[PDB]
Tab-separated table of C-alpha atoms and ligand atoms in Angstrom:
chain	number	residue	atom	x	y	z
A	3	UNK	CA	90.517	-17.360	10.289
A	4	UNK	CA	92.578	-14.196	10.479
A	5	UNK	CA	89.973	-11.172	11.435
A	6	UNK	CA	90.477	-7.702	9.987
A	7	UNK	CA	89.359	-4.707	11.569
A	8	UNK	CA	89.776	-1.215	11.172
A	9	UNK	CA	88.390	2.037	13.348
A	10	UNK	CA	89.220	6.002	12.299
A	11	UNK	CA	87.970	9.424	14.189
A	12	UNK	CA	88.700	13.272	13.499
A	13	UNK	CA	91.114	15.130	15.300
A	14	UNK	CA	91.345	19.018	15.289
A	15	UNK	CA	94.930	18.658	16.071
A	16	UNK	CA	97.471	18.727	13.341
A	17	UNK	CA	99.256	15.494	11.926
A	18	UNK	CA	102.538	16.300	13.266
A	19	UNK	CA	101.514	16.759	16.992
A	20	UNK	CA	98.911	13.506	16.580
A	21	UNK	CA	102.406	11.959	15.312
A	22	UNK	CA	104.097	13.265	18.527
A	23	UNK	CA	101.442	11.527	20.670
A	24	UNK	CA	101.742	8.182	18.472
A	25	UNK	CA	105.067	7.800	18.971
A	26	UNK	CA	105.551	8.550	22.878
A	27	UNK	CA	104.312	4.656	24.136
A	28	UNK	CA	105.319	5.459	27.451
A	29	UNK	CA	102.654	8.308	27.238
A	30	UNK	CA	100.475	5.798	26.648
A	31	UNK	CA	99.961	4.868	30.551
A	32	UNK	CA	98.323	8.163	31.286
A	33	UNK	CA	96.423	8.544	28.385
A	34	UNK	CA	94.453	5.610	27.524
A	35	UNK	CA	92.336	4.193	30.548
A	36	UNK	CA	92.704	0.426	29.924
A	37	UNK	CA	96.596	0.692	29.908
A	38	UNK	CA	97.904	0.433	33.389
A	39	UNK	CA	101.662	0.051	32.651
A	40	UNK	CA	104.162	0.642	29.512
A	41	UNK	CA	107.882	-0.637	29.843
A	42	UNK	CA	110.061	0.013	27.043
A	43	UNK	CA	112.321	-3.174	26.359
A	44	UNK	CA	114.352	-2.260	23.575
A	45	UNK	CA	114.669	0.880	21.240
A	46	UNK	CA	116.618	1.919	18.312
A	47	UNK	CA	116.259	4.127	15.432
A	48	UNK	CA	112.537	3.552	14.031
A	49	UNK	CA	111.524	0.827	16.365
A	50	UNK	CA	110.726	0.299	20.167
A	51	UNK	CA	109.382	-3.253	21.423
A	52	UNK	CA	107.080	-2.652	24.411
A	53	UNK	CA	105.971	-5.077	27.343
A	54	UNK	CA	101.906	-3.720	28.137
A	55	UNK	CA	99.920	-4.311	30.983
A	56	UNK	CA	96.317	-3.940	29.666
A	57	UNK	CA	92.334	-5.307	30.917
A	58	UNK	CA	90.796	-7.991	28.633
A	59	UNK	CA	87.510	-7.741	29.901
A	60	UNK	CA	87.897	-6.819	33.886
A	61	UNK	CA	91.347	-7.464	34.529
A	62	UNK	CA	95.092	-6.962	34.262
A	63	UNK	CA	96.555	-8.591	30.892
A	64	UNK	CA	99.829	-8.842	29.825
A	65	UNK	CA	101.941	-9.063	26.506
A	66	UNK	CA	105.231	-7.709	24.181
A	67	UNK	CA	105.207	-6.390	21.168
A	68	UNK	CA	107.336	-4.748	18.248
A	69	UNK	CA	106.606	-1.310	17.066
A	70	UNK	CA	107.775	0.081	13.556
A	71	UNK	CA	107.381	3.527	13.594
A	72	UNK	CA	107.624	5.458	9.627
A	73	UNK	CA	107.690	9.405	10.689
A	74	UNK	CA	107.712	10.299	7.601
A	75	UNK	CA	104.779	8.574	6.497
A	76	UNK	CA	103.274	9.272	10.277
A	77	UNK	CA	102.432	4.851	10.403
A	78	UNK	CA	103.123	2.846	13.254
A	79	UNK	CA	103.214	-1.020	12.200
A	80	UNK	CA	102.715	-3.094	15.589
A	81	UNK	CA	102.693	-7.318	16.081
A	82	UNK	CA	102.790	-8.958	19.366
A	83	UNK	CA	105.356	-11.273	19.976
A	84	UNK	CA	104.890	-12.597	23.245
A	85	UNK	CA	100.636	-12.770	22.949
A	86	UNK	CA	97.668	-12.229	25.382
A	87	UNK	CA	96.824	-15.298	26.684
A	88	UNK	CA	93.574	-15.587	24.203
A	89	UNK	CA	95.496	-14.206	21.213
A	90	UNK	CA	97.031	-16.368	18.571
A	91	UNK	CA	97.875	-13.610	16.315
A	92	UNK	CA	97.763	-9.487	16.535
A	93	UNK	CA	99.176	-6.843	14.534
A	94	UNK	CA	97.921	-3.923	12.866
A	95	UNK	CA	98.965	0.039	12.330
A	96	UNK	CA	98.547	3.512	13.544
A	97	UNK	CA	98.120	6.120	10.616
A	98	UNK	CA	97.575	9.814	10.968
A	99	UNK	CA	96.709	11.224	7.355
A	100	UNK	CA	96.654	14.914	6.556
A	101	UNK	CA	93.079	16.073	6.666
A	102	UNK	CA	94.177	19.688	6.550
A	103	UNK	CA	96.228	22.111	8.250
A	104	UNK	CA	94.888	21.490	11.336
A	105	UNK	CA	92.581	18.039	11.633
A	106	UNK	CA	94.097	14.612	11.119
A	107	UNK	CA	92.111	11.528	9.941
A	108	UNK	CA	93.140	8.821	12.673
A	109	UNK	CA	92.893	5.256	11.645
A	110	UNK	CA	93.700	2.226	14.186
A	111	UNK	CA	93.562	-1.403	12.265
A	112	UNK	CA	93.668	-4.943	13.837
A	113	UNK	CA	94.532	-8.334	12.538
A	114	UNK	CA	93.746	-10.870	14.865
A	115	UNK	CA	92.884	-14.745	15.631
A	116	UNK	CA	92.394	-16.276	18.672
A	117	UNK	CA	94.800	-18.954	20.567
A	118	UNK	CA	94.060	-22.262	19.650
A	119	UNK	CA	92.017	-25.012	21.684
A	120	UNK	CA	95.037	-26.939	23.644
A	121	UNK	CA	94.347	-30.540	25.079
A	122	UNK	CA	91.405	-29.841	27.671
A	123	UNK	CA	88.863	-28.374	24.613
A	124	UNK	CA	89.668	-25.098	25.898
A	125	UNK	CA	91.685	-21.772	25.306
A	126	UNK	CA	93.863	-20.728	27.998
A	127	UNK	CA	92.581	-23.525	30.405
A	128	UNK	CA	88.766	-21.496	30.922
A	129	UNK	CA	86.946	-20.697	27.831
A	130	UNK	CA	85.104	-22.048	24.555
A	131	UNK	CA	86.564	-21.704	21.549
A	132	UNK	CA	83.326	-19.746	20.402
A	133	UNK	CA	83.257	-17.889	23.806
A	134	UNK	CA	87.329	-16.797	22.952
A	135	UNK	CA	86.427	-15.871	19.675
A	136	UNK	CA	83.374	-13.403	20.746
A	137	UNK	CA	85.472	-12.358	23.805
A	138	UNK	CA	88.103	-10.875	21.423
A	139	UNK	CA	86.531	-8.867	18.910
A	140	UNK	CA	85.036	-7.506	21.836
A	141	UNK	CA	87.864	-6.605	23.585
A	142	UNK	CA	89.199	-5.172	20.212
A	143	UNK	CA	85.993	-3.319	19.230
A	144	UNK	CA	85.870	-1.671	23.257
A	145	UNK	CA	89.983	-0.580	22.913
A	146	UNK	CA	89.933	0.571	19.314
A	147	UNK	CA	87.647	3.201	20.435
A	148	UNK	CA	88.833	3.756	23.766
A	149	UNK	CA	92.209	4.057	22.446
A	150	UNK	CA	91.373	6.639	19.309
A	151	UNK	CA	89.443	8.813	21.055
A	152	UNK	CA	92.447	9.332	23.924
A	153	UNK	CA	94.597	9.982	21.260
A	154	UNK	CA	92.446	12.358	19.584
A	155	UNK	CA	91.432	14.368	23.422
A	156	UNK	CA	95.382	14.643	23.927
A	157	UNK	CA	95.990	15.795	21.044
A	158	UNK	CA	92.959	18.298	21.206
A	159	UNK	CA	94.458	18.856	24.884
A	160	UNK	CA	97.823	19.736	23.953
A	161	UNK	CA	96.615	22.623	20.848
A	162	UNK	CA	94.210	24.078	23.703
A	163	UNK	CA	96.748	23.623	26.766
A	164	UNK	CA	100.102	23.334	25.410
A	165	UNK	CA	99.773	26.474	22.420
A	166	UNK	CA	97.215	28.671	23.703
A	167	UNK	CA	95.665	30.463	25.182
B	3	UNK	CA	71.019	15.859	19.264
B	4	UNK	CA	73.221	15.891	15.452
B	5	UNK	CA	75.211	11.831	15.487
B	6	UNK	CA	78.104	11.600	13.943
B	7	UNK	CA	80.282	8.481	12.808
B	8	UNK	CA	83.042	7.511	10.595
B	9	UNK	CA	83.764	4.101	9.242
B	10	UNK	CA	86.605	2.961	7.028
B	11	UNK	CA	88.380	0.433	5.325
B	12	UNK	CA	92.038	-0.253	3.218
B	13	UNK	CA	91.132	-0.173	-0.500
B	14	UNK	CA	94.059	-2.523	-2.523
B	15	UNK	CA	94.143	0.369	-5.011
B	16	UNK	CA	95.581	3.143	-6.059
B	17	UNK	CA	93.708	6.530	-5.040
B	18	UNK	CA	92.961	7.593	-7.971
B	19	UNK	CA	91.264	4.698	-9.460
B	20	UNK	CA	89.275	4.731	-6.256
B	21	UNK	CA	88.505	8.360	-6.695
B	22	UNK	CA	86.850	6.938	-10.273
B	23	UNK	CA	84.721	4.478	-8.973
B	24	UNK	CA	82.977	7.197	-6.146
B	25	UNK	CA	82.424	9.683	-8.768
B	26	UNK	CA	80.712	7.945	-11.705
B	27	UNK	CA	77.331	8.237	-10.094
B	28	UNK	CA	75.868	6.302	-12.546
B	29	UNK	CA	77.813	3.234	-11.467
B	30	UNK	CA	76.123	2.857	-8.174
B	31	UNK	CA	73.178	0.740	-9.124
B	32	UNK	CA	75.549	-1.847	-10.565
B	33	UNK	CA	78.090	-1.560	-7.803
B	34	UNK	CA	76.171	-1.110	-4.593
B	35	UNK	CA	73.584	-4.005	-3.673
B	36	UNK	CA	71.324	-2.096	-1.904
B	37	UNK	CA	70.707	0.593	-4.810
B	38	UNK	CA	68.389	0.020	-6.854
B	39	UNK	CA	68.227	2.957	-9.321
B	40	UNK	CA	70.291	6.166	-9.487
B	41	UNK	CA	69.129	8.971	-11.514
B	42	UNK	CA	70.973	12.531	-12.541
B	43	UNK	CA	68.511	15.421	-12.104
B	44	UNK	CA	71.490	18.107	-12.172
B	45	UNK	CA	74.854	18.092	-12.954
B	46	UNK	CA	77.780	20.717	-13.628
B	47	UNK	CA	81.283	21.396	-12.880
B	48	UNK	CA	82.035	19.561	-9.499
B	49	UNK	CA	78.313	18.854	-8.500
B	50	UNK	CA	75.831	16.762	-8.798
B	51	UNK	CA	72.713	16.442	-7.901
B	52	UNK	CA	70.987	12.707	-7.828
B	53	UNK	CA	67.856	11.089	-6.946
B	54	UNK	CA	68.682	7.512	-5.488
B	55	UNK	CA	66.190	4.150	-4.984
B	56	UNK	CA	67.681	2.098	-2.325
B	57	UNK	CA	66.161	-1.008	0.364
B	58	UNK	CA	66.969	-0.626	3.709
B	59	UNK	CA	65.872	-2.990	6.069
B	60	UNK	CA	62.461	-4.245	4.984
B	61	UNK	CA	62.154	-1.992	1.788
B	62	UNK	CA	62.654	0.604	-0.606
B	63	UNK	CA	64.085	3.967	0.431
B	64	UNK	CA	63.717	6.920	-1.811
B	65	UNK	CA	66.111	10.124	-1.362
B	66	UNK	CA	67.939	13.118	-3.126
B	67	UNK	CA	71.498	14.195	-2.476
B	68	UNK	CA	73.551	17.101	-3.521
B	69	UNK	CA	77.035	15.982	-3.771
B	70	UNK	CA	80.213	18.324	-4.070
B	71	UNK	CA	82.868	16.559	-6.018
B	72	UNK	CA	86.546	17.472	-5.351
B	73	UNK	CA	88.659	15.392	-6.998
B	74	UNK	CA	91.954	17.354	-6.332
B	75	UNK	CA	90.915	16.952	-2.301
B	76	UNK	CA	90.089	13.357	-2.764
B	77	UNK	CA	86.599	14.148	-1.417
B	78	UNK	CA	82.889	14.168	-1.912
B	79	UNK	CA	80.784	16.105	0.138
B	80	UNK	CA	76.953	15.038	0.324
B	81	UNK	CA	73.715	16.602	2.031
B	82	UNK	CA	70.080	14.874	1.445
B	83	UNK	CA	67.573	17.739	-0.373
B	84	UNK	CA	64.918	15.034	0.603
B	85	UNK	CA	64.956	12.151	2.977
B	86	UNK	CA	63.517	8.966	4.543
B	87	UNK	CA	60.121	9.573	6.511
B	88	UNK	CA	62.078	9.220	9.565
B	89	UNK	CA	65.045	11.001	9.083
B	90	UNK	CA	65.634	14.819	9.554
B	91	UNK	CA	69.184	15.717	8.501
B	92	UNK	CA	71.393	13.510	6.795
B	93	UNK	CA	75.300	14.748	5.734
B	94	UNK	CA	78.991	13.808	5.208
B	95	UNK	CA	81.671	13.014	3.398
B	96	UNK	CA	83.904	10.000	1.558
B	97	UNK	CA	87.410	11.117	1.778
B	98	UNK	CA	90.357	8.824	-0.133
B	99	UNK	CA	93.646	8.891	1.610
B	100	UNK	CA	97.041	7.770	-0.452
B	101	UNK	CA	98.359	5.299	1.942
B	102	UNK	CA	101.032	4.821	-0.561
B	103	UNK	CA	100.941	3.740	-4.521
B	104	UNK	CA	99.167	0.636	-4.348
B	105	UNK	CA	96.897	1.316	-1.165
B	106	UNK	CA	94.069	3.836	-0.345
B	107	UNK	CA	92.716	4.500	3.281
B	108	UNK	CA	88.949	5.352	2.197
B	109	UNK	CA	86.796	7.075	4.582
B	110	UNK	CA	82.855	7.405	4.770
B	111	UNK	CA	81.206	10.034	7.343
B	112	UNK	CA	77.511	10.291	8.404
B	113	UNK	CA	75.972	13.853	10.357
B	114	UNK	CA	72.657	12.571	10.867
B	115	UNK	CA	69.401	13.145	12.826
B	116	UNK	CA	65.807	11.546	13.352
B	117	UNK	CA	62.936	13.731	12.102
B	118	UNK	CA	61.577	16.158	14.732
B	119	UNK	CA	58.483	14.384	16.309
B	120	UNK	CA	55.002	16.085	15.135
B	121	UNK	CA	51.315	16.961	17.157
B	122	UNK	CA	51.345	13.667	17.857
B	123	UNK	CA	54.396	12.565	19.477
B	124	UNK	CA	55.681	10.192	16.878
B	125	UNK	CA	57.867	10.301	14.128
B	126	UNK	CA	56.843	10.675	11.110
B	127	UNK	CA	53.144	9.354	12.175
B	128	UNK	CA	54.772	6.067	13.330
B	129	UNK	CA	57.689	5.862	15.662
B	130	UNK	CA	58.386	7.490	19.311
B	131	UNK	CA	61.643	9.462	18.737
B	132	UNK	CA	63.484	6.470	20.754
B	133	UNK	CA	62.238	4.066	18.447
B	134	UNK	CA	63.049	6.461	15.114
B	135	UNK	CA	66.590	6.964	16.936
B	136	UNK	CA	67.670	3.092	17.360
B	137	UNK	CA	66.061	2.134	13.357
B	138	UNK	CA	68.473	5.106	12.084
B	139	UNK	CA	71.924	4.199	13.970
B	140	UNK	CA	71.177	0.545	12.923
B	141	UNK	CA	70.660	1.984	9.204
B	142	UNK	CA	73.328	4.583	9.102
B	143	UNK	CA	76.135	1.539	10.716
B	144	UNK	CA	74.723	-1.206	8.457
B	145	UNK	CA	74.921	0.661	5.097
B	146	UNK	CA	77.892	2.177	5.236
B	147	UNK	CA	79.844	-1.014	6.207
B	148	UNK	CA	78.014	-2.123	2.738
B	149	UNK	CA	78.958	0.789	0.937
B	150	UNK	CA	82.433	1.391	1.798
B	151	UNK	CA	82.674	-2.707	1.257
B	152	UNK	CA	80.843	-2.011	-2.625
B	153	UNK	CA	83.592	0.572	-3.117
B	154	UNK	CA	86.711	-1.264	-2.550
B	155	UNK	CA	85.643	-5.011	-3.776
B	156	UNK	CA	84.894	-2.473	-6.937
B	157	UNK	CA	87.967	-0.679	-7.135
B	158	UNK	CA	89.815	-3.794	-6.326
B	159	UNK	CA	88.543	-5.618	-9.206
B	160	UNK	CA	89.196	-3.263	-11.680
B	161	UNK	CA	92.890	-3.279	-10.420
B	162	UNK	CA	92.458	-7.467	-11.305
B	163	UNK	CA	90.952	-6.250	-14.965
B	164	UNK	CA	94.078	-3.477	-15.919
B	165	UNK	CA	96.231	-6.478	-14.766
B	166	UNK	CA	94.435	-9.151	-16.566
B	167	UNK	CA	96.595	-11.109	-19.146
B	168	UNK	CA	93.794	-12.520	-21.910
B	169	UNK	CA	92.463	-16.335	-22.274
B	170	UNK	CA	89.712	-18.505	-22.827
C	1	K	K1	95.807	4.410	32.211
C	2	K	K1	72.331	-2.896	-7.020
């Protein structure tokens, strides 16, 4: 069972510089407070695959991933390649719509599963399948909004800071 | 304090037929479980005006809502002229992004505060405002999951009945 989720907020920043914040991952390390470390692995026009250091419920968590990044349509398309050690399955996209001039409608989506049971009845050699399953969405539920609303006070930051006055 | 959330979901349709589906009003009975009864008490050039029957929770919640229709900005605006007992303000917006030909992001918004309490502490002659508070986020998140859900499994099929080759 493949899960969908999706999460959106406002931002008074327009699409273009929401876009700009998108699309710098290293960035990423200093603006979103679960994300201790970004290393950029390989990069090339419209794509960057990423190595992340990230908590999954109180501690350091790592994993790869491929980013596809569509400027023009301001959409990120991300899947994990090398997966957390409770994920099975994760992709999903970034998309800034046009609200108006100056606000963007920012949506972050998830499609998950969980890592199968191996041998022992567990996943990842410590929890239920059940207690992986819960464990997840909450992890993806916590970041989803952790993660939109840095985007959106950087973005917010940079129109204040960076323009004026 | 004035709440605000937003909630959304990826309609497999094109905008516009999703744009069809939020404003025919008089759809919503059929097409949302929860409403019972929708009625039309004014109406005019990008408004309307509509008295709506609709269980939450337990039972049966009456209100009135003006909505703003703006079809060329893919939005309807809406503000309750009359409420639930224990609700004070209630706003927002749907707003139906192209995500590209075949795909629609579709966005519902709630502005939205208990009713002040009264003489005697309580809202609405029943509820301390904490109590008031937690039953209206628990309303507000559980009905608009429903209703943006309504909308797209809607707009959805009606993309399976333009498609739809006849049989038996
Ligand atoms: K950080
Ligand atoms: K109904």
């Amino acid at each position: 069972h493949m899960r969908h989720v999706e999460h959106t907020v406002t931002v008074a920043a327009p699409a273009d510089l929401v876009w700009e914040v998108l699309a710098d991952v290293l960035g990423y390390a200093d603006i979103f407070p679960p994300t201790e470390k970004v290393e950029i692995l390989e990069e090339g026009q419209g794509y960057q695959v990423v190595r992340l250091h990230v908590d999954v419920a109180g501690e350091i968590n790592t994993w790869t991933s491929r980013r596809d990044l569509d400027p023009a349509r301001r959409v990120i398309a991300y899947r994990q390649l090398e997966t957390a050690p409770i994920v099975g399955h994760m992709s999903g996209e970034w998309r800034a719509f046009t609200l108006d001039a100056e606000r963007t409608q920012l949506v972050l989506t998830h499609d998950f599963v969980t890592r199968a049971a191996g041998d022992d009845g567990l996943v990842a050699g410590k929890l239920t399948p059940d207690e992986a399953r819960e464990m997840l969405e909450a992890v993806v539920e916590r970041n989803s909004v952790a993660d939109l609303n840095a985007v959106l006070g950087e973005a917010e930051r940079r129109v204040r800071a960076a323009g004026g006055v």
